[PDB]
PDB file of C-alpha atoms and ligand atoms in Angstrom:
ATOM      1  CA  UNK A   1      -1.746  23.905  18.810  1.00  0.00           C
ATOM      2  CA  UNK A   2      -3.774  21.682  16.438  1.00  0.00           C
ATOM      3  CA  UNK A   3      -6.883  23.907  16.493  1.00  0.00           C
ATOM      4  CA  UNK A   4      -5.173  27.208  15.665  1.00  0.00           C
ATOM      5  CA  UNK A   5      -3.339  25.705  12.652  1.00  0.00           C
ATOM      6  CA  UNK A   6      -5.875  23.451  10.921  1.00  0.00           C
ATOM      7  CA  UNK A   7      -9.479  23.662   9.743  1.00  0.00           C
ATOM      8  CA  UNK A   8     -11.253  20.301  10.061  1.00  0.00           C
ATOM      9  CA  UNK A   9     -13.539  19.055   7.267  1.00  0.00           C
ATOM     10  CA  UNK A  10     -15.673  15.916   6.764  1.00  0.00           C
ATOM     11  CA  UNK A  11     -14.764  12.326   7.662  1.00  0.00           C
ATOM     12  CA  UNK A  12     -13.005  10.575   4.762  1.00  0.00           C
ATOM     13  CA  UNK A  13     -12.996   7.065   6.262  1.00  0.00           C
ATOM     14  CA  UNK A  14     -12.627   4.970   9.405  1.00  0.00           C
ATOM     15  CA  UNK A  15     -11.551   1.447  10.234  1.00  0.00           C
ATOM     16  CA  UNK A  16      -8.748  -0.524  11.811  1.00  0.00           C
ATOM     17  CA  UNK A  17      -6.477   2.362  10.846  1.00  0.00           C
ATOM     18  CA  UNK A  18      -8.525   4.795  12.987  1.00  0.00           C
ATOM     19  CA  UNK A  19     -10.430   7.874  11.763  1.00  0.00           C
ATOM     20  CA  UNK A  20      -9.253  10.094   8.880  1.00  0.00           C
ATOM     21  CA  UNK A  21     -10.756  13.550   8.237  1.00  0.00           C
ATOM     22  CA  UNK A  22     -10.368  15.976   5.351  1.00  0.00           C
ATOM     23  CA  UNK A  23      -8.718  19.250   6.361  1.00  0.00           C
ATOM     24  CA  UNK A  24      -7.093  22.526   5.377  1.00  0.00           C
ATOM     25  CA  UNK A  25      -3.978  24.162   6.823  1.00  0.00           C
ATOM     26  CA  UNK A  26      -5.160  27.700   7.657  1.00  0.00           C
ATOM     27  CA  UNK A  27      -1.835  29.474   6.970  1.00  0.00           C
ATOM     28  CA  UNK A  28      -1.558  28.613   3.252  1.00  0.00           C
ATOM     29  CA  UNK A  29      -4.867  26.823   2.453  1.00  0.00           C
ATOM     30  CA  UNK A  30      -2.992  23.529   1.850  1.00  0.00           C
ATOM     31  CA  UNK A  31      -5.275  20.454   1.586  1.00  0.00           C
ATOM     32  CA  UNK A  32      -4.445  17.987   4.386  1.00  0.00           C
ATOM     33  CA  UNK A  33      -5.625  14.695   5.889  1.00  0.00           C
ATOM     34  CA  UNK A  34      -6.088  14.502   9.661  1.00  0.00           C
ATOM     35  CA  UNK A  35      -5.628  10.961  11.024  1.00  0.00           C
ATOM     36  CA  UNK A  36      -6.639  10.082  14.607  1.00  0.00           C
ATOM     37  CA  UNK A  37      -5.571   6.892  16.258  1.00  0.00           C
ATOM     38  CA  UNK A  38      -6.404   5.745  19.787  1.00  0.00           C
ATOM     39  CA  UNK A  39      -3.473   4.825  22.065  1.00  0.00           C
ATOM     40  CA  UNK A  40      -5.251   1.632  23.233  1.00  0.00           C
ATOM     41  CA  UNK A  41      -5.458   0.530  19.586  1.00  0.00           C
ATOM     42  CA  UNK A  42      -1.690   0.839  19.002  1.00  0.00           C
ATOM     43  CA  UNK A  43       0.339  -2.271  19.872  1.00  0.00           C
ATOM     44  CA  UNK A  44       3.353  -1.421  17.701  1.00  0.00           C
ATOM     45  CA  UNK A  45       5.382   1.342  19.369  1.00  0.00           C
ATOM     46  CA  UNK A  46       8.548   2.997  18.146  1.00  0.00           C
ATOM     47  CA  UNK A  47      11.081   5.643  19.096  1.00  0.00           C
ATOM     48  CA  UNK A  48      12.320   8.803  17.371  1.00  0.00           C
ATOM     49  CA  UNK A  49      15.970   9.993  17.268  1.00  0.00           C
ATOM     50  CA  UNK A  50      14.781  12.431  19.980  1.00  0.00           C
ATOM     51  CA  UNK A  51      14.135   9.413  22.217  1.00  0.00           C
ATOM     52  CA  UNK A  52      10.385  10.097  22.107  1.00  0.00           C
ATOM     53  CA  UNK A  53       7.809   7.290  22.336  1.00  0.00           C
ATOM     54  CA  UNK A  54       5.554   7.418  19.239  1.00  0.00           C
ATOM     55  CA  UNK A  55       3.503   4.963  17.136  1.00  0.00           C
ATOM     56  CA  UNK A  56       5.685   2.916  14.754  1.00  0.00           C
ATOM     57  CA  UNK A  57       3.700   4.532  11.927  1.00  0.00           C
ATOM     58  CA  UNK A  58       5.217   7.974  12.692  1.00  0.00           C
ATOM     59  CA  UNK A  59       8.746   6.480  12.753  1.00  0.00           C
ATOM     60  CA  UNK A  60       8.181   4.768   9.380  1.00  0.00           C
ATOM     61  CA  UNK A  61       6.655   7.832   7.671  1.00  0.00           C
ATOM     62  CA  UNK A  62       9.586  10.015   8.789  1.00  0.00           C
ATOM     63  CA  UNK A  63      11.992   7.375   7.436  1.00  0.00           C
ATOM     64  CA  UNK A  64      10.306   7.388   3.985  1.00  0.00           C
ATOM     65  CA  UNK A  65       9.844  11.191   3.640  1.00  0.00           C
ATOM     66  CA  UNK A  66      11.478  13.010   0.719  1.00  0.00           C
ATOM     67  CA  UNK A  67      10.574  14.731  -2.580  1.00  0.00           C
ATOM     68  CA  UNK A  68       9.335  11.348  -3.856  1.00  0.00           C
ATOM     69  CA  UNK A  69       5.559  11.450  -4.369  1.00  0.00           C
ATOM     70  CA  UNK A  70       5.007   7.643  -4.365  1.00  0.00           C
ATOM     71  CA  UNK A  71       4.567   7.592  -0.586  1.00  0.00           C
ATOM     72  CA  UNK A  72       2.197   9.740   1.485  1.00  0.00           C
ATOM     73  CA  UNK A  73       4.067  12.587   3.203  1.00  0.00           C
ATOM     74  CA  UNK A  74       3.796  13.162   6.960  1.00  0.00           C
ATOM     75  CA  UNK A  75       3.600  16.944   7.446  1.00  0.00           C
ATOM     76  CA  UNK A  76       3.209  17.043  11.244  1.00  0.00           C
ATOM     77  CA  UNK A  77       2.046  15.034  14.270  1.00  0.00           C
ATOM     78  CA  UNK A  78       0.598  15.686  17.723  1.00  0.00           C
ATOM     79  CA  UNK A  79       0.155  13.737  20.957  1.00  0.00           C
ATOM     80  CA  UNK A  80      -3.101  13.984  22.913  1.00  0.00           C
ATOM     81  CA  UNK A  81      -3.798  12.358  26.308  1.00  0.00           C
ATOM     82  CA  UNK A  82      -5.505   9.345  24.685  1.00  0.00           C
ATOM     83  CA  UNK A  83      -4.670   9.619  20.977  1.00  0.00           C
ATOM     84  CA  UNK A  84      -2.059  10.525  18.374  1.00  0.00           C
ATOM     85  CA  UNK A  85      -2.949  12.847  15.497  1.00  0.00           C
ATOM     86  CA  UNK A  86      -1.161  12.686  12.142  1.00  0.00           C
ATOM     87  CA  UNK A  87      -1.222  15.466   9.536  1.00  0.00           C
ATOM     88  CA  UNK A  88      -0.763  13.952   6.079  1.00  0.00           C
ATOM     89  CA  UNK A  89      -0.583  15.524   2.614  1.00  0.00           C
ATOM     90  CA  UNK A  90      -3.829  15.284   0.640  1.00  0.00           C
ATOM     91  CA  UNK A  91      -3.815  15.155  -3.193  1.00  0.00           C
ATOM     92  CA  UNK A  92      -6.875  16.736  -4.808  1.00  0.00           C
ATOM     93  CA  UNK A  93      -8.757  15.341  -6.656  1.00  0.00           C
ATOM     94  CA  UNK A  94      -7.978  11.809  -5.449  1.00  0.00           C
ATOM     95  CA  UNK A  95      -9.550   8.324  -5.314  1.00  0.00           C
ATOM     96  CA  UNK A  96      -8.308   5.098  -3.684  1.00  0.00           C
ATOM     97  CA  UNK A  97      -7.562   2.122  -5.934  1.00  0.00           C
ATOM     98  CA  UNK A  98     -10.282  -0.015  -4.315  1.00  0.00           C
ATOM     99  CA  UNK A  99     -12.990   2.512  -5.252  1.00  0.00           C
ATOM    100  CA  UNK A 100     -11.415   3.001  -8.682  1.00  0.00           C
ATOM    101  CA  UNK A 101     -11.481  -0.752  -9.426  1.00  0.00           C
ATOM    102  CA  UNK A 102     -15.016  -1.076  -8.011  1.00  0.00           C
ATOM    103  CA  UNK A 103     -16.204   1.564 -10.522  1.00  0.00           C
ATOM    104  CA  UNK A 104     -14.269   0.337 -13.572  1.00  0.00           C
ATOM    105  CA  UNK A 105     -14.144  -3.375 -12.855  1.00  0.00           C
ATOM    106  CA  UNK A 106     -11.093  -5.092 -14.365  1.00  0.00           C
ATOM    107  CA  UNK A 107      -8.453  -2.591 -15.516  1.00  0.00           C
ATOM    108  CA  UNK A 108      -6.999  -2.507 -19.039  1.00  0.00           C
ATOM    109  CA  UNK A 109      -3.522  -4.053 -18.980  1.00  0.00           C
ATOM    110  CA  UNK A 110      -1.817  -0.831 -20.101  1.00  0.00           C
ATOM    111  CA  UNK A 111      -3.400   0.903 -17.093  1.00  0.00           C
ATOM    112  CA  UNK A 112      -2.640  -1.965 -14.710  1.00  0.00           C
ATOM    113  CA  UNK A 113       1.014  -1.904 -15.910  1.00  0.00           C
ATOM    114  CA  UNK A 114       1.390   1.813 -15.142  1.00  0.00           C
ATOM    115  CA  UNK A 115      -0.305   1.480 -11.733  1.00  0.00           C
ATOM    116  CA  UNK A 116       1.591  -1.680 -10.755  1.00  0.00           C
ATOM    117  CA  UNK A 117       4.929  -0.146 -11.829  1.00  0.00           C
ATOM    118  CA  UNK A 118       4.316   2.927  -9.703  1.00  0.00           C
ATOM    119  CA  UNK A 119       3.389   0.708  -6.737  1.00  0.00           C
ATOM    120  CA  UNK A 120       6.669  -1.202  -7.243  1.00  0.00           C
ATOM    121  CA  UNK A 121       8.682   2.051  -7.275  1.00  0.00           C
ATOM    122  CA  UNK A 122       6.905   3.103  -4.066  1.00  0.00           C
ATOM    123  CA  UNK A 123       7.566  -0.209  -2.266  1.00  0.00           C
ATOM    124  CA  UNK A 124      11.227  -0.308  -3.404  1.00  0.00           C
ATOM    125  CA  UNK A 125      11.628   3.215  -2.008  1.00  0.00           C
ATOM    126  CA  UNK A 126      10.173   2.047   1.322  1.00  0.00           C
ATOM    127  CA  UNK A 127      12.572  -0.936   1.476  1.00  0.00           C
ATOM    128  CA  UNK A 128      15.515   1.236   0.447  1.00  0.00           C
ATOM    129  CA  UNK A 129      14.572   3.477   3.413  1.00  0.00           C
ATOM    130  CA  UNK A 130      14.500   0.504   5.840  1.00  0.00           C
ATOM    131  CA  UNK A 131      10.678   0.382   5.957  1.00  0.00           C
ATOM    132  CA  UNK A 132       8.363  -2.604   5.400  1.00  0.00           C
ATOM    133  CA  UNK A 133       4.693  -1.734   4.728  1.00  0.00           C
ATOM    134  CA  UNK A 134       3.092  -5.131   5.476  1.00  0.00           C
ATOM    135  CA  UNK A 135      -0.326  -3.990   4.177  1.00  0.00           C
ATOM    136  CA  UNK A 136       0.025  -3.458   0.386  1.00  0.00           C
ATOM    137  CA  UNK A 137      -3.495  -3.477  -1.126  1.00  0.00           C
ATOM    138  CA  UNK A 138      -5.916  -1.431  -3.272  1.00  0.00           C
ATOM    139  CA  UNK A 139      -7.407   0.348  -0.209  1.00  0.00           C
ATOM    140  CA  UNK A 140      -3.903   1.571   0.743  1.00  0.00           C
ATOM    141  CA  UNK A 141      -3.181   3.170  -2.639  1.00  0.00           C
ATOM    142  CA  UNK A 142      -4.381   6.644  -3.630  1.00  0.00           C
ATOM    143  CA  UNK A 143      -4.588   7.820  -7.242  1.00  0.00           C
ATOM    144  CA  UNK A 144      -3.782  11.480  -7.934  1.00  0.00           C
ATOM    145  CA  UNK A 145      -6.386  11.739 -10.705  1.00  0.00           C
ATOM    146  CA  UNK A 146      -4.891  14.857 -12.361  1.00  0.00           C
ATOM    147  CA  UNK A 147      -1.256  13.710 -12.502  1.00  0.00           C
ATOM    148  CA  UNK A 148      -1.740   9.934 -12.781  1.00  0.00           C
ATOM    149  CA  UNK A 149       0.485   9.435  -9.722  1.00  0.00           C
ATOM    150  CA  UNK A 150      -0.125   6.749  -7.089  1.00  0.00           C
ATOM    151  CA  UNK A 151       0.602   7.019  -3.351  1.00  0.00           C
ATOM    152  CA  UNK A 152       1.078   4.400  -0.643  1.00  0.00           C
ATOM    153  CA  UNK A 153      -0.817   5.217   2.549  1.00  0.00           C
ATOM    154  CA  UNK A 154      -1.291   3.718   6.034  1.00  0.00           C
ATOM    155  CA  UNK A 155       1.931   2.482   7.601  1.00  0.00           C
ATOM    156  CA  UNK A 156       0.084   1.373  10.747  1.00  0.00           C
ATOM    157  CA  UNK A 157       0.852  -2.328  10.143  1.00  0.00           C
ATOM    158  CA  UNK A 158       4.416  -1.601   9.066  1.00  0.00           C
ATOM    159  CA  UNK A 159       7.744  -2.467  10.642  1.00  0.00           C
ATOM    160  CA  UNK A 160      11.412  -1.651  10.330  1.00  0.00           C
ATOM    161  CA  UNK A 161      12.757  -3.815   7.511  1.00  0.00           C
ATOM    162  CA  UNK A 162      14.925  -6.691   8.750  1.00  0.00           C
ATOM    163  CA  UNK A 163      16.593  -9.763   7.232  1.00  0.00           C
ATOM    164  CA  UNK A 164      15.366 -12.101   9.984  1.00  0.00           C
ATOM    165  CA  UNK A 165      11.962 -13.804  10.300  1.00  0.00           C
ATOM    166  CA  UNK A 166       8.784 -11.922  11.254  1.00  0.00           C
ATOM    167  CA  UNK A 167       6.524 -13.840  13.654  1.00  0.00           C
ATOM    168  CA  UNK A 168       3.971 -11.019  14.025  1.00  0.00           C
ATOM    169  CA  UNK A 169       1.469  -9.755  11.438  1.00  0.00           C
ATOM    170  CA  UNK A 170      -1.336  -7.188  11.525  1.00  0.00           C
ATOM    171  CA  UNK A 171      -2.091  -6.440   7.850  1.00  0.00           C
ATOM    172  CA  UNK A 172      -4.843  -7.882   5.665  1.00  0.00           C
ATOM    173  CA  UNK A 173      -5.168 -11.668   5.867  1.00  0.00           C
ATOM    174  CA  UNK A 174      -6.434 -12.167   2.289  1.00  0.00           C
ATOM    175  CA  UNK A 175      -3.177 -10.500   1.107  1.00  0.00           C
ATOM    176  CA  UNK A 176      -0.956 -12.497   3.487  1.00  0.00           C
ATOM    177  CA  UNK A 177       1.267 -15.349   2.204  1.00  0.00           C
ATOM    178  CA  UNK A 178       0.814 -19.144   2.756  1.00  0.00           C
ATOM    179  CA  UNK A 179       3.877 -19.268   5.057  1.00  0.00           C
ATOM    180  CA  UNK A 180       2.051 -16.863   7.402  1.00  0.00           C
ATOM    181  CA  UNK A 181      -1.163 -18.882   7.244  1.00  0.00           C
ATOM    182  CA  UNK A 182       0.596 -22.221   7.863  1.00  0.00           C
ATOM    183  CA  UNK A 183       3.535 -21.334  10.123  1.00  0.00           C
ATOM    184  CA  UNK A 184       3.055 -17.749  11.372  1.00  0.00           C
ATOM    185  CA  UNK A 185       6.457 -17.024   9.844  1.00  0.00           C
ATOM    186  CA  UNK A 186       7.531 -14.872   6.885  1.00  0.00           C
ATOM    187  CA  UNK A 187      10.324 -12.692   5.569  1.00  0.00           C
ATOM    188  CA  UNK A 188       9.678  -9.096   4.566  1.00  0.00           C
ATOM    189  CA  UNK A 189      10.531  -8.873   0.854  1.00  0.00           C
ATOM    190  CA  UNK A 190       9.057 -12.227  -0.227  1.00  0.00           C
ATOM    191  CA  UNK A 191       5.825 -11.621   1.728  1.00  0.00           C
ATOM    192  CA  UNK A 192       5.639  -8.184   0.064  1.00  0.00           C
ATOM    193  CA  UNK A 193       6.009  -9.813  -3.377  1.00  0.00           C
ATOM    194  CA  UNK A 194       3.109 -12.188  -2.576  1.00  0.00           C
ATOM    195  CA  UNK A 195       0.848  -9.267  -1.643  1.00  0.00           C
ATOM    196  CA  UNK A 196       1.926  -7.587  -4.897  1.00  0.00           C
ATOM    197  CA  UNK A 197       0.770 -10.679  -6.812  1.00  0.00           C
ATOM    198  CA  UNK A 198      -2.622 -10.443  -5.072  1.00  0.00           C
ATOM    199  CA  UNK A 199      -2.762  -6.718  -5.949  1.00  0.00           C
ATOM    200  CA  UNK A 200      -1.894  -7.288  -9.618  1.00  0.00           C
ATOM    201  CA  UNK A 201      -4.507 -10.059  -9.958  1.00  0.00           C
ATOM    202  CA  UNK A 202      -7.008  -7.679  -8.359  1.00  0.00           C
ATOM    203  CA  UNK A 203      -6.155  -4.946 -10.897  1.00  0.00           C
ATOM    204  CA  UNK A 204      -6.612  -7.163 -13.972  1.00  0.00           C
ATOM    205  CA  UNK A 205      -9.514  -9.320 -12.691  1.00  0.00           C
ATOM    206  CA  UNK A 206     -11.501  -6.804 -10.619  1.00  0.00           C
ATOM    207  CA  UNK A 207     -11.317  -8.962  -7.469  1.00  0.00           C
ATOM    208  CA  UNK A 208      -8.796 -10.832  -5.278  1.00  0.00           C
ATOM    209  CA  UNK A 209      -7.917 -14.450  -6.184  1.00  0.00           C
ATOM    210  CA  UNK A 210      -8.354 -16.027  -2.722  1.00  0.00           C
ATOM    211  CA  UNK A 211     -10.849 -15.689   0.136  1.00  0.00           C
ATOM    212  CA  UNK A 212     -10.256 -18.670   2.463  1.00  0.00           C
ATOM    213  CA  UNK A 213      -7.103 -19.944   4.194  1.00  0.00           C
ATOM    214  CA  UNK A 214      -7.279 -23.209   2.198  1.00  0.00           C
ATOM    215  CA  UNK A 215      -7.265 -21.226  -1.058  1.00  0.00           C
ATOM    216  CA  UNK A 216      -4.142 -19.285   0.025  1.00  0.00           C
ATOM    217  CA  UNK A 217      -2.318 -22.502   1.068  1.00  0.00           C
ATOM    218  CA  UNK A 218      -3.224 -24.251  -2.210  1.00  0.00           C
ATOM    219  CA  UNK A 219      -2.274 -21.159  -4.255  1.00  0.00           C
ATOM    220  CA  UNK A 220      -4.056 -22.316  -7.417  1.00  0.00           C
ATOM    221  CA  UNK A 221      -4.733 -19.222  -9.531  1.00  0.00           C
ATOM    222  CA  UNK A 222      -7.867 -19.134 -11.693  1.00  0.00           C
ATOM    223  CA  UNK A 223      -8.344 -16.220 -14.102  1.00  0.00           C
ATOM    224  CA  UNK A 224     -11.967 -15.059 -14.216  1.00  0.00           C
ATOM    225  CA  UNK A 225     -11.196 -12.303 -16.753  1.00  0.00           C
ATOM    226  CA  UNK A 226      -9.216 -12.236 -19.993  1.00  0.00           C
ATOM    227  CA  UNK A 227      -5.588 -11.630 -18.979  1.00  0.00           C
ATOM    228  CA  UNK A 228      -2.540 -11.904 -21.292  1.00  0.00           C
ATOM    229  CA  UNK A 229      -0.218 -14.901 -20.850  1.00  0.00           C
ATOM    230  CA  UNK A 230       2.625 -12.602 -19.887  1.00  0.00           C
ATOM    231  CA  UNK A 231       0.618 -11.002 -17.070  1.00  0.00           C
ATOM    232  CA  UNK A 232      -0.724 -14.407 -15.958  1.00  0.00           C
ATOM    233  CA  UNK A 233       2.889 -15.644 -15.774  1.00  0.00           C
ATOM    234  CA  UNK A 234       4.036 -12.689 -13.678  1.00  0.00           C
ATOM    235  CA  UNK A 235       1.081 -13.138 -11.292  1.00  0.00           C
ATOM    236  CA  UNK A 236       1.752 -16.870 -10.869  1.00  0.00           C
ATOM    237  CA  UNK A 237       5.440 -16.112 -10.236  1.00  0.00           C
ATOM    238  CA  UNK A 238       4.655 -13.553  -7.514  1.00  0.00           C
ATOM    239  CA  UNK A 239       2.202 -16.065  -6.034  1.00  0.00           C
ATOM    240  CA  UNK A 240       4.681 -18.996  -5.853  1.00  0.00           C
ATOM    241  CA  UNK A 241       4.030 -21.149  -2.765  1.00  0.00           C
ATOM    242  CA  UNK A 242       7.697 -21.282  -1.703  1.00  0.00           C
ATOM    243  CA  UNK A 243       8.929 -17.750  -0.812  1.00  0.00           C
ATOM    244  CA  UNK A 244      12.319 -18.391  -2.474  1.00  0.00           C
ATOM    245  CA  UNK A 245      10.521 -19.237  -5.750  1.00  0.00           C
ATOM    246  CA  UNK A 246       9.108 -15.684  -5.862  1.00  0.00           C
ATOM    247  CA  UNK A 247      10.722 -13.035  -8.098  1.00  0.00           C
ATOM    248  CA  UNK A 248      12.870 -10.262  -6.672  1.00  0.00           C
ATOM    249  CA  UNK A 249      11.665  -6.701  -7.284  1.00  0.00           C
ATOM    250  CA  UNK A 250      14.318  -6.448 -10.019  1.00  0.00           C
ATOM    251  CA  UNK A 251      12.960  -9.613 -11.667  1.00  0.00           C
ATOM    252  CA  UNK A 252       9.400  -8.246 -11.531  1.00  0.00           C
ATOM    253  CA  UNK A 253      10.378  -4.954 -13.170  1.00  0.00           C
ATOM    254  CA  UNK A 254      12.494  -6.818 -15.764  1.00  0.00           C
ATOM    255  CA  UNK A 255       9.557  -9.118 -16.624  1.00  0.00           C
ATOM    256  CA  UNK A 256       8.360  -8.890 -20.261  1.00  0.00           C
ATOM    257  CA  UNK A 257       4.856  -7.811 -19.134  1.00  0.00           C
ATOM    258  CA  UNK A 258       6.400  -4.790 -17.400  1.00  0.00           C
ATOM    259  CA  UNK A 259       8.133  -3.383 -20.539  1.00  0.00           C
ATOM    260  CA  UNK A 260       7.347   0.084 -21.986  1.00  0.00           C
ATOM    261  CA  UNK A 261       5.402   1.550 -19.048  1.00  0.00           C
ATOM    262  CA  UNK A 262       3.457   4.771 -19.637  1.00  0.00           C
ATOM    263  CA  UNK A 263       4.559   7.849 -17.711  1.00  0.00           C
ATOM    264  CA  UNK A 264       2.087   9.022 -15.014  1.00  0.00           C
ATOM    265  CA  UNK A 265       0.957  12.063 -17.062  1.00  0.00           C
ATOM    266  CA  UNK A 266       0.440   9.906 -20.183  1.00  0.00           C
ATOM    267  CA  UNK A 267      -1.497   7.501 -17.919  1.00  0.00           C
ATOM    268  CA  UNK A 268      -3.806  10.296 -16.655  1.00  0.00           C
ATOM    269  CA  UNK A 269      -4.356  11.672 -20.178  1.00  0.00           C
ATOM    270  CA  UNK A 270      -5.331   8.294 -21.686  1.00  0.00           C
ATOM    271  CA  UNK A 271      -7.123   6.667 -18.732  1.00  0.00           C
ATOM    272  CA  UNK A 272      -8.153   9.184 -16.082  1.00  0.00           C
ATOM    273  CA  UNK A 273      -9.032  12.604 -17.530  1.00  0.00           C
TER     274      UNK A 273
HETATM  275  C1  LIG B 301      -9.722  10.707  -0.186  1.00  0.00           C
HETATM  276  C2  LIG B 301      -8.568  10.381   0.765  1.00  0.00           C
HETATM  277  N1  LIG B 301      -7.503  11.202   0.801  1.00  0.00           N
HETATM  278  C3  LIG B 301      -6.470  10.951   1.625  1.00  0.00           C
HETATM  279  C4  LIG B 301      -5.369  11.806   1.656  1.00  0.00           C
HETATM  280  C5  LIG B 301      -4.303  11.531   2.509  1.00  0.00           C
HETATM  281  C6  LIG B 301      -4.332  10.411   3.337  1.00  0.00           C
HETATM  282  C7  LIG B 301      -5.438   9.559   3.322  1.00  0.00           C
HETATM  283  C8  LIG B 301      -6.503   9.824   2.452  1.00  0.00           C
HETATM  284  N2  LIG B 301      -7.572   9.003   2.411  1.00  0.00           N
HETATM  285  C9  LIG B 301      -8.608   9.247   1.589  1.00  0.00           C
HETATM  286  N3  LIG B 301      -9.667   8.428   1.558  1.00  0.00           N
HETATM  287  C10 LIG B 301      -9.683   7.064   2.122  1.00  0.00           C
HETATM  288  C11 LIG B 301     -10.752   6.257   1.385  1.00  0.00           C
HETATM  289  C12 LIG B 301     -10.063   7.108   3.609  1.00  0.00           C
HETATM  290  C13 LIG B 301      -9.488   6.295   4.587  1.00  0.00           C
HETATM  291  C14 LIG B 301      -8.461   5.381   4.337  1.00  0.00           C
HETATM  292  C15 LIG B 301      -7.337   5.559   5.375  1.00  0.00           C
HETATM  293  C16 LIG B 301      -6.509   4.272   5.513  1.00  0.00           C
HETATM  294  N4  LIG B 301      -5.285   4.511   6.339  1.00  0.00           N
HETATM  295  C17 LIG B 301      -4.596   5.748   6.303  1.00  0.00           C
HETATM  296  O1  LIG B 301      -3.582   5.915   6.979  1.00  0.00           O
HETATM  297  C18 LIG B 301      -5.062   6.749   5.450  1.00  0.00           C
HETATM  298  C19 LIG B 301      -4.531   7.837   4.897  1.00  0.00           C
HETATM  299  C20 LIG B 301      -5.465   8.423   4.130  1.00  0.00           C
HETATM  300  N5  LIG B 301      -6.594   7.703   4.183  1.00  0.00           N
HETATM  301  C21 LIG B 301      -6.363   6.677   4.987  1.00  0.00           C
END
């Protein structure tokens, strides 16, 4: 079933998420990504409308799937005795934001604005679809280098969006909010805004602002690179200690630093080509 449909290429990466290979769909030569995840390594299980027991990740990807290119598209999935295999769309050429920032260092603010805006549109879409990502970070963002379009990947730490408190977390600790560190409690949207503040800092400074738990709890932001006052203000707002002091997504996108965003194509032409 999987063998007669897909042609497996080289390993793209492996980690907590599992193992992801490059691939081609034989029928139409479509570039794909083949993700393998061990059953033992999945703690978060979900159910389809069919009543079928699948990883939460599959549930969440189906819930976010549409013509919108800001989230990775799940094309197909398969169950093996000891693993689940996910077929994902693969943009070509592509590079993850972590690698991109590593190569460029700190991003120009115009470029950071375009990237951050697109991330915001992607996250808002997820929330509007009842999906919380819980792992927003540079490594989980792909850049379509031709089109200047960004894509959220890896919903393996995600959950159904709810208005009540989360007492579980499996994403990246250095992106997690002080209320998680201190109390093991957080709410979806406000935790997501914190991680977005970490991400934005990372874009404009070339690195994350905090490494240790004590740094997260203190939440004192030091800028190691030249960053405009407007951007600094937005970052500090997203990184407010009290979750209710953090901006809503609307407030972020209405912020003066976020005005006059480039289109993705304009972004690629100026910054990527
Ligand atoms: C180059 C590349 N293309 C991709 C296309 C579709 C989906 C993924 C993807 N990943 C890469 N490269 C990255 C660096 C490799 C592993 C990261 C891994 C992280 N978790 C995922 O679910 C996922 C999806 C893709 N990649 C991942």
